[PDB]
Amino acid sequence: IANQPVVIDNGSGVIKAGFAGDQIPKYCFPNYVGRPKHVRVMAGALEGDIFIGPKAEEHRGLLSIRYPMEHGIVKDWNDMERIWQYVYSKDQLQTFSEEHPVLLTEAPLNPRKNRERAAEVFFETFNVPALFISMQAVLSLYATGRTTGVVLDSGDGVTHAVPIYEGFAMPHSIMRIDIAGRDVSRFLRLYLRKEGYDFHSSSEFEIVKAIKERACYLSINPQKDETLETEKAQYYLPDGSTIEIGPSRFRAPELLFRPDLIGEESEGIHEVLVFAIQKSDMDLRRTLFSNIVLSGGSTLFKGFGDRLLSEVKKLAPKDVKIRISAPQERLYSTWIGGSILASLDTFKKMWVSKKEYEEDGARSIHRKTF
Amino acid sequence: ESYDVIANQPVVIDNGSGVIKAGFAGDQIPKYCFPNYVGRPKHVRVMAGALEGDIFIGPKAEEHRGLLSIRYPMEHGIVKDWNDMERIWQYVYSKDQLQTFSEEHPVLLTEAPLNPRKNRERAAEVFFETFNVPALFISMQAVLSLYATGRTTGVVLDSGDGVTHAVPIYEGFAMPHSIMRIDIAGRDVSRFLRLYLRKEGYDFHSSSEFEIVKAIKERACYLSINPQKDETLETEKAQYYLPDGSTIEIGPSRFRAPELLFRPDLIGEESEGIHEVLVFAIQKSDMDLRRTLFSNIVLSGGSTLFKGFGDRLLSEVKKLAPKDVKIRISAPQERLYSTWIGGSILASLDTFKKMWVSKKEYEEDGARSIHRKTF
Amino acid sequence: IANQPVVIDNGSGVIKAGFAGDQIPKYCFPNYVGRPKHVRVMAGALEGDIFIGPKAEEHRGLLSIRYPMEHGIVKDWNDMERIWQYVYSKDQLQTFSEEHPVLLTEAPLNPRKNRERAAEVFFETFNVPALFISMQAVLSLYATGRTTGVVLDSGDGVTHAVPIYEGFAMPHSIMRIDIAGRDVSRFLRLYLRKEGYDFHSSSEFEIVKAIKERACYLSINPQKDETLETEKAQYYLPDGSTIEIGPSRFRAPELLFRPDLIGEESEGIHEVLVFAIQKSDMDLRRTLFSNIVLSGGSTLFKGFGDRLLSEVKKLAPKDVKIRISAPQERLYSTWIGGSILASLDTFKKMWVSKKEYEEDGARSIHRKTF
Ligand SMILES: Nc1ncnc2c1ncn2[C@@H]1O[C@H](COP(=O)(O)OP(=O)(O)O)[C@@H](O)[C@H]1O
Ligand SMILES: Nc1ncnc2c1ncn2[C@@H]1O[C@H](COP(=O)(O)OP(=O)(O)O)[C@@H](O)[C@H]1O
Ligand SMILES: Nc1ncnc2c1ncn2[C@@H]1O[C@H](COP(=O)(O)OP(=O)(O)O)[C@@H](O)[C@H]1O
Ligand SMILES: [Mg+2]
Ligand SMILES: [Mg+2]
Ligand SMILES: [Mg+2]
């Protein structure tokens, strides 16, 4: 089809969408479904019992929030279908699913059934002409004008270190851990509870997420700032009241470098990156250490780069150059890479026909992917 | 199925503890308003050709007020004398009011929030058994206030005669667990004014003299921004003219009586003030709504019409609210009639057909069908 | 070296105090301060503006009642100081506070400032030789005599499921909600208002609490009992009047298992227990299900054990034995645990000494408690 293709990066926290070839996704909205929990009494209340997109943010306190994706794995598929039709709704990207091919972006090392059901949903419920599923990290490396390097993509659900060499991501050297920005927000909720601020409500979890985004940082030395009493910085809640955050500012994101602070049997993010680099043959290791690209929202923490540099230097072999690159467009880098990939005419040969899916099934979509 | 008795113009009744406002849906104002009490002849009937009957309701009870002992069927929004309430509802349908038959028109009834369930059950029983109405909807008062004002979001602070309550509503969604209610209202302020006038040398122990205390409360009373500076000072005693032509000097009782609304502890009742009712109703809701609820406050009921009520309510709310939040208190021009105007607007809609409880639905289910399809 | 340590289980509802080694807390009294609200006119009236303990219960109609604690958190610290002074008065414990080490108890996941201020009060005002802020659930399990299990402590202010493994409370599996006996009594007051019987006064809230303790039960099937015709058991008020309760008798303690009845989007008590069990290690889940220990006052509702067992069986996996233990001393289980702990010689190595607090401050309690 000669019509423009649409890139959809369905992250756990935020879902980016846009017609390919644009330098930026203009239709990014949070990835949750809000349903009203109070009883409607008037004639003329808000019509509809499903609230997705900026409307869910406008009427946030009126709604109970439910996240369809957890750790990059779609738990509720009906809500995912609702969100993906909302992507085509008149509010954002007013178009038809039949007119545009879709470049879906998916987390690496996901279960087989997830890709199978995503293809089934996009081919049956949506009469899409052409679907192609890709990864999030290889695109993020495409965005920054490189073909060799390691991408540390840290999103809302999952964080993974992916070494790519000459475009093709090494499937054997992929490292993945499930602690991400959502787990940091939960840890911040627990710590805020330990300061005398209860946010048990589902809509107040978004306020906790906002507090995480706006007032948090990673200390250079963990024990140094842990022992030192930090100044109490005050944050303004939506109602207008104020909360003193205090040590929870720096204790919360420390989960990323110490998963045992919530009893998760997994490696830290610095350990994940260094293990991803060291899982490859040594001739490429010295190049991978130099070409480190941060990606995803959770890498935007104040002081993330310095602490990651310190930890990687502590772990990596001595006398090896290490350079962390932090692009300003970290949130939208994966979508930018998807747009770049879709702009290439070779993408015309990379998608799967409706006839191809009907004939072969999941075999076609999985042999087409890497 | 089409030209049924259901399709008739419904009758809207807003029965308040102090005043009952009845009319027909579609009218701009309640055409038939009268006090919600029953008068009985106190004296001895000696002349043929006297005032016929022994139950006086409506303007007859008002013009011949001195001739009667007054009994209020409902106190604090709860019906206490059900025979008198039934009599008042029959009078609403009489030749003096609406000139109609109760069996022809559907009914919209208003009720204060958080009332006893038995009150609603008995109201439905009376309006389906004694009055054989086709259908009955029992509405909240705040929803009607928002209907009348044309809005859909707001914290309705309704201070009637027997009940004061704050109901928060957001985008047509009502939060039942943020609704607050106190039983201090205009009746309590009038009783407290009677107590103060006793403390100033005027005894109004007669039941028909309680309405004179009501009139004094309506005319010669106000609210002070600073209660302590008026407490320590002695003001100039205003002069009130009684119905018989004699005069009284009210003085410090003018402002200390309506102060009961913001301080129930003046009568030893340890309940929230009206400002605390409103602010707690806002602050019990979800946080993301609260700011909008602070910018949409709607007043209703006659007890909000005290000279200086808006200013003092704004001052107290601003004292309790978090700093730098836009507080915008609104009020309709006809505060007494707002709830009925909303009831008329709601009963005018075609959606109202799907809201009331049909008579047959009442017969099959009984009290259960009233508890649902209400609020 | 000091006298025998004094155990003080300060709940939100009732404080229970005694000396370590006693079989039961000999000095239990409600945790509120009563102040007279009427006008003293004649000489010979009651002396003192502060009434605490049985003097507050004898003259309950004369006093406005104030609760210092709310959801396990001290809201009024002057009243808390008054109450802890009364614990040491000639009516309770008959001793000076400068001679006995203290074993205070605190609910899990409390604010840090609460523990800090409690230690400051106990070391400055009362000049205790030593202090040890413990946690209620682990003490309750010690009182039962077991070392591994789950303690579902449901008190007046806060309910919480804490799993303990070999005496150590797993901190990343603690579940807590603030819906407890006081919330149930407030809900009962609301329902009695909906039944025509209206109570406003803080002294009449104690009558509502008595109605809860006397005539309230948990139905095994809420929907079955909901639809049936009620019995309307009659309760005799202190003044001699009677009230017919009816449906409010069983819907009031329903709040423990369904917080959404008051608009809270928080887990139920059964959900608290099951989520605490399922948040723990996969190896421990079988032995945690086989070892559940009830505690606190709110677990004494008629039919509480059967209802909780039914809910847990509904939520628990199949082929897993469930054994909810409901010891007779549920009210004093945590105090008995504090007494058992304080009797040991190892307790000497546990407390924060007075000199340690003098030289360190809040950090001494912060390291020693955890
Ligand atoms: N400045 C910031 N500091 C810390 N966290 C941030 C910041 N900006 C965004 N985030 C977090 O990043 C997450 C979104 O990252 P994103 O790359 O969109 O994840 P995904 O790829 O799963 O959509 C959000 O959960 C948000 O909490
Ligand atoms: N101008 C006024 N100033 C003070 N109080 C007033 C005024 N007008 C009416 N009221 C009081 O308001 C009450 C009537 O309020 P209303 O809105 O009828 O409440 P309800 O609907 O519960 O009857 C009366 O008891 C009266 O004392
Ligand atoms: N027999 C009973 N039935 C129901 N509730 C009870 C009973 N006995 C006590 N309670 C409730 O338990 C609460 C006290 O529990 P307790 O274990 O003392 O709490 P805390 O841990 O705060 O001391 C009181 O609020 C009371 O309402
Ligand atoms: Mg991503
Ligand atoms: Mg009214
Ligand atoms: Mg306890």
SS3 per residue for A228-290: CCCCCCEEECCCCCEEECCCHHHHCHHHHCCHHHHCCCCCCHHHHHHHHHHCCCHHHHHHHHH
Q: By the CB < 8 Å criterion, does B173 face chain A?
A: yes
Closest CA to B78 of B188, B140, B162, B164: B162
Q: Chain B contacts of C265, Cβ < 8 Å?
A: none
Q: Read off the CATH number of the domain in which B247 is found.
A: 3.90.640.10
If you count them, how many residues does chain C have?
Answer: 370
Q: What token pair was written down for C25?
A: 């807390």
Closest CA to B256 of B183, B192, B342: B192
Q: Helix, strand, or coil here: C14?
A: strand
Confirm if A16 and A335 have CB atoms less than 8 A apart.
yes
Strand intervals (E) in chain A: 6-10, 14-19, 29-30, 33-36, 39-40, 63-66, 69-70, 73-74, 102-105, 130-134, 148-154, 159-165, 168-169, 175-177, 234-236, 242-244, 292-295, 324-325, 352-353
Distance CA B357, CA B136 (A): 5
CB count in 10 Å sphere of residue A13: 21
Distance CA B79, CA B110 (A): 13
Confirm if C28 and C173 have CB atoms less than 8 A apart.
no
* Mutation test residue for ligand 3: of C74, C80, C183, C213, the one with most atoms within 8 Å of CB: C213
Parallel, antiparallel, or unpaired: how do β-strands A102-105 and A6-10 relate?
parallel
Q: Report chain C's terminal Cα–Cα distance, integer Å.
A: 24
CB count in 10 Å sphere of residue B159: 28
Burial of A2 (0-12, 13-18, 19+ CB in 10 A): exposed
Q: Is the CB of B16 under 6 A from ligand 2?
A: yes
Q: Is the CB of B258 under 6 A from ligand 2?
A: no
The three-point CA angle B319-C82-C26 to 5° equals 135
Tell me which residue has its CA closest to atom 7 in ligand 1. A213
Confirm if C50 and C64 have CB atoms less than 8 A apart.
no
Q: What token pair was written down for C108?
A: 């899990």
Q: What token pair was written down for A162?
A: 């992916």
CB burial of A301-337 (b: ≥16 within 10 Å; e: otherwise) equals beebbebbbebbeeebeeeeebebeebeebbbbbbbb
* Mutation test residue for ligand 2: of B75, B213, B218, B299, the one with most atoms within 8 Å of CB: B218
Confirm if C170 and C137 have CB atoms less than 8 A apart.
no
Distance CA C334, CA C340 (A): 10
Q: What token pair was written down for A335?
A: 């979508």
B325/A201 CB distance under 8 A:
no
Measure B207 CA to ligand 4 centroid, in angstroms.
76
Distance CA C167, CA C142 (A): 8
Distance CA A177, CA C241 (A): 65
What ligand is nearest to the CA atom of residue A326? 1
Distance CA B357, CA C194 (A): 22
Helix (H) or strand (E) run with residue B157 in it:
strand B154-159
Q: Helix, strand, or coil here: C49?
A: coil
Q: Helix, strand, or coil here: A14?
A: strand
Distance CA A258, CA A264 (A): 9
Distance CA A222, CA A247 (A): 12
Q: Chain C contacts of A202, Cβ < 8 Å?
A: 265
Measure B207 CA to ligand 1 centroid, in angstroms.
70
CB-based contacts of A278: which residues, under 8 Å, 6+ apart?
Answer: A285
Q: By the CB < 8 Å criterion, does A315 face chain C?
A: no
Distance CA A314, CA A262 (A): 23
Measure C299 CA to ligand 3 centroid, in angstroms.
8
Parallel, antiparallel, or unpaired: how do β-strands A324-325 and A352-353 relate?
unpaired
Write the single-letter amino acid at B158: D
CA of C155, closest atom in ligand 3: 19
Q: By the CB < 8 Å criterion, does B317 face chain A?
A: no
Q: CA distances (Å), B301 to each of A199, A252, B30, B218, B338, in order? A: 36, 50, 15, 13, 8
DSSP state of C61: G
Distance CA C319, CA C323 (A): 13
Which residue has tokens 């899916």?
A: A357
Q: By the CB < 8 Å criterion, does A282 face chain B?
A: no
Distance CA B160, CA A368 (A): 72
Which residue has tokens 């003097």?
A: C55
B117/C200 CB distance under 8 A:
no
CB-based contacts of B14: which residues, under 8 Å, 6+ apart?
Answer: B20, B21, B22, B30, B110, B141, B144, B339, B340, B343
Q: Helix, strand, or coil here: A86?
A: helix
Experimental technique for the deposited model: cryo-EM
What ligand is nearest to the CA atom of residue C158? 3
Measure B253 CA to ligand 1 centroid, in angstroms.
62
Confirm if C269 and C260 have CB atoms less than 8 A apart.
no
Domain encompassing residue A240: 181-260
C73/A196 CB distance under 8 A:
yes
Q: Nearest C-alpha of chain C: how many angstroms from A224?
A: 15
Distance CA C129, CA C123 (A): 8
The three-point CA angle C231-C235-C239 to 5° equals 155
What ligand is nearest to the CA atom of residue A304? 1
CA of B20, closest atom in ligand 2: 23
CB-based contacts of B312: which residues, under 8 Å, 6+ apart?
Answer: B223, B224, B225, B262
Radius of gyration of chain A (CA): 21
C265/A194 CB distance under 8 A:
no
A90-99 long-range contacts (CB < 8 A, ≥24 apart) are: A91/A53, A91/A54, A91/A55, A92/A17, A92/A27, A92/A29, A92/A53, A93/A6, A93/A17, A93/A18, A93/A19, A93/A27, A95/A6, A97/A126, A97/A127, A97/A128, A98/A126, A98/A127, A98/A128, A98/A129, A99/A1, A99/A3, A99/A129
Q: By the CB < 8 Å criterion, does A343 face chain C?
A: no
A40/B172 CB distance under 8 A:
yes
